[PDB]
Structures are given as structure tokens and as C-alpha cells.
Paper text:
Connexins (Cxs) assemble as hexameric hemichannels (HCs) that reach the cellular surface and dock with their counterparts on the neighboring cells, forming the gap junction channels (GJCs) and coupling cells metabolically and electrically. Pancreatic Cx36 plays a crucial role in insulin secretion, whereas in the brain Cx36 is involved in neuronal synchronization. Dysregulation of Cx36 is associated with epilepsy, traumatic brain injury, and ischemia, and elevated gap junction coupling in these conditions contributes to neuronal death.
In the case of the quinine- and quinidine-bound Cx36, the drugs are somewhat less well resolved at the nominal resolution of 2.73 Å and 2.9 Å, respectively (compared to mefloquine in the 2.14 Å cryo-EM map). Nevertheless, the density map quality allows us to model the drugs based on the observed features confidently. Although quinine and quinidine are stereoisomers, each is readily accommodated within its Cx36-binding site. Thus, the binding of each of the three compounds creates two hydrophobic rings in the translocation pathway in the GJC. Moreover, in the case of quinidine, the drug in the observed conformation completely closes the pore.
Author numbering:
A (entry chain D), B (entry chain C), C (entry chain B), D (entry chain A), E (entry chain F), F (entry chain E): 19 to 102, 194 to 282
The structure:
């Protein structure tokens, strides 16, 4: 049952790309304009927002998508050159795809966790002592985070199934 | 009378996609900037808006559209793979489409109801006791909600008609 | 003269679609941001604007365009299905197009009238008693309304001419 | 010399379309947000702006372009219909194009004049007595107005030359 | 060595078009929003900005690009018409291109100079006596101005080289 | 193996172009609106922002991408011209590409360094003495800077490998 694996993998990849490309930018549009802190100190908003969200989720997901798609591009361009052998490059492509997917999933978990809290406690200069700041659309962002994690997990499972189907003896050679 | 069913189903799907893609983003553009609460507490607006609208209607509808279209994509890519059998995958595709459509309709009803009230009563921290907040374009959003519900219901009816036409004996086998 | 009527009908349909798609969104961009009421009560602007304009003109016109174009799409997809009889579906398509056009014209008249006044008197909660609100670009909106009404009337006349040419005896059967 | 007349006419039409489509929207983006009146009365800005600029230049020019292009569309669709005679429709097309171009040029002159003043005197309700308002980018708008007038005049001259070349005897018949 | 001249000319033209189309609009987006004058007089900002920048650089460059490309369009359409002689139109096309390029370069120099100062002294009504106004991103605009001047100069040199290659005897005839 | 070297070079070039075109504009959208200085002097924000960021990173990267792609365009157009010899232009194209890449990398290092500080100290007129200003999203910009530097370094290494493979004897001739 390897053909169904590839079918589902392609469908899931397209689904993830479409969802991101259509809604991600709109969800994270006013992340900084609607981020407000309870203070009068100029520049506290910028520092506290920067500490709270070092990298926006959408940038990370775009980078992940492009990086995960890279090996297929490598294989396609190698095939194009080879005309005007290919049974070995495929195994290395699969291995690299597996590694990249697993790494990106683990990185997302270690970077963002599983939820976006509605309050933040900030103690960065120039803010005096400790201040409280309020986030925009925490619930929608939490839902988006969980959904992306689930899709990435499905992709990882399918890739592992494909790699196992190929077998360890072929991978070693 | 199965051909007219498929014709109407395709027309309705295209109609829904076009309507959403053309007007949905514009309708819900200033949902948060025009949402105002009667208070002086910083951060009350963000919390009350997040509680009032955990997920925007437009994103739910986009997700529904992509998810409902997925099975056709799976069938098409399976057909492409088969060339360079198909009379059985079709039944499962129809069943899954029916299930997804019914589930999404029920979920919409249980999430949003049938109207968008013009006032909201919010008692979430940091707001003090109860505060009153005012929504933007409640009537247009109500009309959009009802129209989308009606279109989804028509799609459900057509899908059920198709499934019944196929017959229970074929579905069992 | 049915064929020359068809030529004119196609030209006017394309003209209407182009005009809407190019200028409608820009005209109605700042309808709510520039709508101001003479009061200090929070939330009066939102309620009064919602009462004044339950549905924006542009969205109504987009819906009308798609709905009017639907029957041609149904006929085209039926023709595609028939290959890989057609002289009867055409009459029903014409009748439905006529009915839809007339209904949309009447609905526009009953919903918006023939002008957009520059002042509005609003007595909706939370506004205290009666307040006065001021509209944005009333004259441009009036011109747009009249122009769309005229184009729709021309389309109705051409459709009626075509239906009359087909004759009542054919329509009956 | 009819070859060069048609060549220049086509080039000029394309030039005008490109210039409008590329710069018109950007020039007139902040016409109303940067329009300011010297008063404290709410609603005076809206009324005075509406009186000063009943119709924006860009929308008038877009309407003119589409209307002027319409006869060519009619001729092309008639030619398409005729396949799956044409030596007469061409003369009427030319006459209608000439009439439309001349009418639009005269209308522009009578609507906007030749310059956009930097100050406006407004005495419209609710403004008290007479107030002074200030326009945004008057000089760029004046340049755009003059350039469009010159291009339209060139088009009119070329169309008149073409019509004269056809001759009065043919036009009469 | 004429082929290299044409190759470099085409490459430079494409380079200029790409650079403008990609960055010009973004650079000059907030030219008027961030232009601030030290005064309390309403309407002083509009008048002083209009006096400082009668025409934005980006619009001048767009006009220059289209005008310079026009003669090639004229030649191409003449060639297209000629099928369903050409060795003479080419010389006039080259001469007109040279003249247009030189004229636009000189006009840019006489209009904008070589730098955008960071301060402006304005004495236009309604501003009282002299006021000081501050520009947005003077350095980026200076860099853009110098770069465009250099590219236009390279184009002028290449066009002059081509024209000289053709020779004076051929041009005279 | 330059074959796989060229494969990797093409893949990394496409990767860089995609990343820039998709995220660069969004990251640097509100660079100036969110830049705030601790002062009351009008015009201090503009001057201090201009001194802090003479040229935005995104524009520099766009210019670098187009300039680096230019030699391939020159070679392609020369090949097109040659039809309706080519073994020497390739070496010069490679040399020029190497030089451009190295120059742009060095320029980026000397212009921006390796980090974007969160505070800036500004002493430019009209600001009185020395003032403190606060940057927007310093961490995301630092990450972007480092990532672009790494990608450019990889491209430089691959280009150097290709040039070395071609050999010094061929380059000399
Ligand atoms: C005018 C369009 C702009 C809007 N987004 C930012 C740059 C462009 C395009 C891009 C988006 O439409 C988009 C298109 C295609 N693929 C995408 C893939 C990912 C993505 O992530 C935000 C956005 C994508
Ligand atoms: C510059 C264009 C941007 C505007 N919207 C957000 C990202 C892109 C595209 C998309 C919209 O045009 C759009 C296009 C196509 N299909 C769509 C399907 C659904 C949709 O839901 C809002 C929007 C769609
Ligand atoms: C980035 C582009 C966005 C701008 N408008 C909203 C969603 C998209 C597209 C659409 C408009 O360009 C448009 C395109 C094509 N047909 C249209 C038909 C009707 C229409 O009514 C406003 C707008 C149309
Ligand atoms: C996202 C794109 C939007 C920007 N303008 C408003 C609606 C759309 C398209 C249109 C413009 O690009 C445009 C394209 C093509 N032809 C045009 C013709 C005239 C025009 O006048 C403003 C604008 C045109
Ligand atoms: C949604 C897109 C809009 C953005 N700019 C204004 C109108 C349209 C297109 C245009 C720009 O993308 C553009 C495209 C193609 N050629 C251009 C050539 C010149 C240019 O100068 C600003 C802008 C160009
Ligand atoms: C409506 C679209 C506008 C958005 N950006 C500014 C002008 C246009 C296009 C461009 C961007 O989509 C884009 C497209 C394609 N290639 C690009 C390459 C580089 C780039 O750097 C910001 C932006 C690119």
C-alpha cells in the first residue's frame, strides 16, 4: 500500500500550502498594531512585542514549506538535466525529506508550544520594572498552531511509512 | 435524473466559491478596528473581541470549501497515478463528501447560530465586572451567514440524492 | 433581430461586469471610516451606519451579476456533459434569465430607491433620542446607482425582445 | 495615408490605457483623507468635499475608455457570430466612435475645466456661512488633466482624418 | 560591434523596467503622510508639500518608460499590419528613440537636480511668513535619483553608438 | 562535479528569490510608522529614521538579485540573436557572476553588519542634543540578515567551485 501513501501525501501537501497561502497573511496582519501594553513609557510596546514574538508564525511556516519542497525541486532539475542512475537519487531524496520534516516539527514545538496566551509579562528596557501587555486574536492563533502541528504530524507519518516500505537494505546501499 | 443532479451540484459549488472569494474578505476587513467597548481599561477591547468571535466566519468557510473539495482532488490524482478499479473509489469518494458536508453544516450551526447580535456583554479580565461592546455591520454578516447556510443545505440535499441513486447495495459492496 | 439582440446583450453584459469590477470596490472603500455622527456616545456610529446601509450597493451588484450569469453556466456544463435535446434547455434558460433580471431590478428599486441622501436621522440604541449623521460621497453613489439601473433596464428590454422572438407557442411546449 | 493613421490611433489608445491603469489609482488614493477644511463643525468636511468633486477624474476617464472601446467589441463579436456584409458595419462603427470621442472630450471640458485650484470656498450645510477648504496635490492633478485632454484631442483628430478618408459619399450610403 | 550594442541595450531596458516596477511604488508610498511642517495653521502641510514636490519621481519615470517604448510598439504594429519598406522605418524609429531619451534625461536634470534635501523652507499661503518642513527618506530618494540618471545615461550612450553605426549618409536619405 | 554543482546553484537561487518575494515586503512594511523617538520636536522622527536606515534591507536585496541574474539574461539574449562562438561567452559570464556575487556579499557586510540593535542614539538636526529612538522588530530583521548572508555565501562557494573546475588556462584564453 505505497501508492495510497503518495496520493495522500500529495493531497496533504497541497492542502497545507493552500490553507497557508490563503489565510495566514490575513490572520497575522494587525499583530503589532493591536498589541498594547499598560504603560506611558515610549518604546515599551516595541520592545515587549519583540520579546513576546521573536518570529511570527507565518514566516516560520512559509520557510518550512519552501524548505520541505526543496528536495523535489532538486530531483526534478536533476532529471531535466539528465535528458538533453535516477533509481538511487530517489532514496536520498526521501531520507532528506523525512529528516527535514521531523526537524521542522520539533523546532515548531520547541519554539511556540501549543497555545498563545492572552497576557504577557514584560520586563525589558525601557519598560520600568514589570508591565502587562495584551495580545490580539489569541484563540485564532492557537487554533492555527494546533492545525498546522496536526498536518505536519500526518506528513511525518506518511513519509516514515514510505521510507519503511523502501526498506533498510536499500537505504544502506 | 442523475445528470441534472451533478450539473446543479457543480454549478452550486462554483457559485459558492466565487461569492466567498470575491466578497468575504472585504466584508470582514475591519471587524476588529471598528469593534469598540464602553470602557477606559487598556486591553479590554482585545479580550472582549476575542471572546465574542473566537474564529471569523470567513476563515471557517474557506476551510470548509477546501476540505469539501479534497476528495475530488484525491480521486483525480489517483486516476492520474493509475495511468502512466476506478468504479469503486467513486462510491467511497461520494460517501466521504456527504459526511464532510453534513458535518460542516452542523458545526456551523452549533458555532455561530443564525444571527449576529449588535450588542455584546463581556466580563473577561481585565475588564471590570460587565462591559458593553458594539459590533460592526451585524446585518450584512447575518445575511451572509444565512445565505451560506442555505447554499450548504442545497449541496447536502443534492449529495444525498446522488448517494441514494447509487443505492445501498452498491455502497455495502 | 434575435442575433443582433444577442450581440448587444453580450456587449452590455461585458460592459457592466467591467465597470463593476474596476471601480465599485474603490468607490465604496471608506464608506464606514468616513461616516460620522454628531454625538459623544460610544457605539452610536456603528449602529447608525448599520441602520442606514444594511447592505452595501457593491455586494448586491456582485451577487446580481453572478446570479444572472448562472443559467449560462448551467447550459454550458450540460452541453459538456452531453458530449463524452439541446434545443429545449435553451428556452428554459432564456425564461429563467428573464425572470432573474426582472426580479433583481425590482429588488434594487425597492431596496435603494434612486438617490443617496447626504444626511441621515438615526434613533437607534445606544444613541440618545435622535441624532444626525453625514454620508460620504453621496453624489458619486447616486450616479453609480442610476447608471446601474439604466444598464439593467437595457438588459431586461433585450431579454424580453429575445423571448418574444422565440414566440409563445414554443415557450408553452 | 491611411496606414499611419490607424497605426498611430492604435498606439495612442494603448498608451492612454497603460498610463491610466498604472498611475491613476495611485494619484487619487488620498483625495478625501487629505482634504481638510478650517472649521470645527462635524460633517463639514464630507459635504464640502462632495460639493468640490462630485465625480473623481479617474472614474470619469475609466468610463470614457470603456465606452470608447465598446464599438470595436461590438464589431469583433459580430464578426465572430457571422462565422460559425462586414464592409458596411465598419462605417457605422467609425461614425459612432467619432461621436463618442467628441462627446467625451466636450463633457470633460465642461465638467472639470483646465486646472484644479488649491483652495475651495464652501457654503453647504452644515457648514456655518462660508468656509475655506484645501485640496491635495492640485498640481499633479492639473498636469494629469491637461495630458488626458491632449491625448483625447489627438485621438479625435485621427478619427476625423479616418472618417474624411472614407468619404462622405460612402458614409451617406 | 553592433550586436553587443543591441544586446546591452535590451538588457538595460529590461533592468530599468524591473527595478522601477518592483521598488518604486513602495519607496514613495508615504511621501505625503510622513511630510510634516512646524506650524499649527490648517492646510499648510498640503500647500507646502505641493510646492516641494509638484510631480513625484515615480510617475515621471513611468511616463518616461512608456514614452521611450512607444516607437518600438509603432514599428511592431506596422510590421504586423504589413503582413496580412521596413528597412527605412527603422532609421526614423532609431532617431526618434534617441531624441526622446535625450529629452527625458535633460528634463529630469532640470526638474529634480541630483539630491533631495532633508529640509524645505515654504512660504505659500495659508502659511504665515516662512515655515520649515521635513521630508521622508531623503537618502533613499537621492540614491534612486542618481541610479536612474546613470541608467538613462547608459541608454543614451548605447543609442548614440547605434545611430553612429548606421551612418550619416543613410540617415540623410 | 559541476553538474550537481549547477543543480545546487539553481536550487539555491530559486530558494532565495522565493523567500524574498514572499516575505520581505511584509516584514519591512511598518518600518517607519512603528519607529518612535523620545522627544517632542517635530521632524526628529524623520531625520533619525533616515540616519538609522539610509537604505532598507529589502531594496538592497532586490537590487542584488536582479544584478546577479543579469549575466544569464545577457547570455540568453545573445544566444537568441545568434539564431535567426558560444563556448567563450560562457567563461566571461561565469567570471562576471563570480565578481558580482562577491562584491554584493562584501557590500552587505560593510553596510549592515550582522545585527539590528533595538536602540538608536540620534544627534541630527532638528533633534536637540542627543535623543534615543526605538526600532521595530529587531530580532526578525537580524534573523533575515543572517539567513541572507548564509545563502549568499553558499552561492559564492558554488560559483567559485565552478570557476575552478573550468580551470585557469581556459580563463586566461
Ligand atoms: C499581491 C500578492 C501578494 C500577497 N502575498 C504576499 C506577496 C504576494 C503573494 C502572496 C500570496 O498571495 C501568496 C501567493 C502564492 N503563494 C503563496 C505562498 C505562501 C504565502 O505565504 C504567506 C503566500 C503566497
Ligand atoms: C492579492 C490577492 C490576495 C487576496 N486574497 C488573499 C490572498 C490573495 C488571494 C486571495 C483572494 O483573492 C482569493 C483568490 C482565489 N481564490 C480564493 C479563494 C478563497 C478566498 O477566501 C478568502 C480568497 C481567494
Ligand atoms: C487582489 C485582487 C482582489 C480585488 N477584488 C477583491 C478580491 C480580488 C479580486 C477582486 C477584483 O479585482 C475582481 C477581479 C475579477 N472579477 C471581479 C468581479 C467582480 C468584482 O466585484 C467587486 C471584483 C472582481
Ligand atoms: C489588484 C488589482 C486591482 C487594482 N485596480 C483596481 C481593481 C484591480 C485591477 C485595477 C488595475 O490594476 C487595472 C488593471 C487592468 N486594467 C485596468 C484598467 C483601468 C484601471 O483604471 C483605474 C485599472 C486597471
Ligand atoms: C495590484 C497591482 C498594482 C500595483 N501597481 C499599480 C497598479 C497595479 C500594477 C502596478 C505594478 O505592479 C506594475 C505592474 C506591471 N508593470 C508595472 C510597470 C510600472 C510600474 O510603475 C509603478 C508598475 C507596474
Ligand atoms: C501586487 C503585487 C505587488 C507586490 N510586490 C510589489 C509590486 C507587485 C509585485 C511584488 C511582489 O509580489 C513580487 C512579485 C514577483 N517577483 C518579486 C520579486 C521580488 C520582490 O521583492 C520585494 C517582489 C516580487
Amino acid at each position: 500500500s505505497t501508492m495510497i501513501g503518495r496520493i495522500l501525501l500529495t493531497v496533504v501537501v497541497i492542502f497545507r500550502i493552500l490553507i497557508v497561502a490563503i489565510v495566514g497573511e490575513t490572520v497575522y496582519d494587525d499583530e503589532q498594531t493591536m498589541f498594547v501594553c499598560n504603560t506611558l513609557q515610549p518604546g515599551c510596546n516595541q520592545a515587549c512585542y519583540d520579546r513576546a514574538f521573536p518570529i511570527s508564525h507565518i514566516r516560520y511556516w512559509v520557510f518550512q514549506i519552501i524548505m520541505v519542497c526543496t528536495p523535489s525541486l532538486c530531483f526534478i532539475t536533476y532529471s531535466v538535466h539528465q535528458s538533453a542512475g535516477i533509481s538511487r537519487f530517489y532514496i536520498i531524496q526521501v531520507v532528506f525529506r523525512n529528516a527535514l520534516e521531523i526537524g521542522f516539527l520539533v523546532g515548531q514545538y520547541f519554539l511556540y508550544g501549543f497555545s498563545v496566551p492572552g497576557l504577557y509579562e514584560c520586563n525589558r528596557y525601557p519598560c520600568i520594572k514589570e508591565v502587562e501587555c495584551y495580545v490580539s486574536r489569541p484563540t485564532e492563533k492557537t487554533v492555527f498552531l494546533v492545525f498546522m502541528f496536526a498536518v505536519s504530524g500526518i506528513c511525518v507519518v506518511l513519509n516514515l511509512a514510505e521510507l519503511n516500505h523502501l526498506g533498510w537494505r536499500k537505504i544502506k546501499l
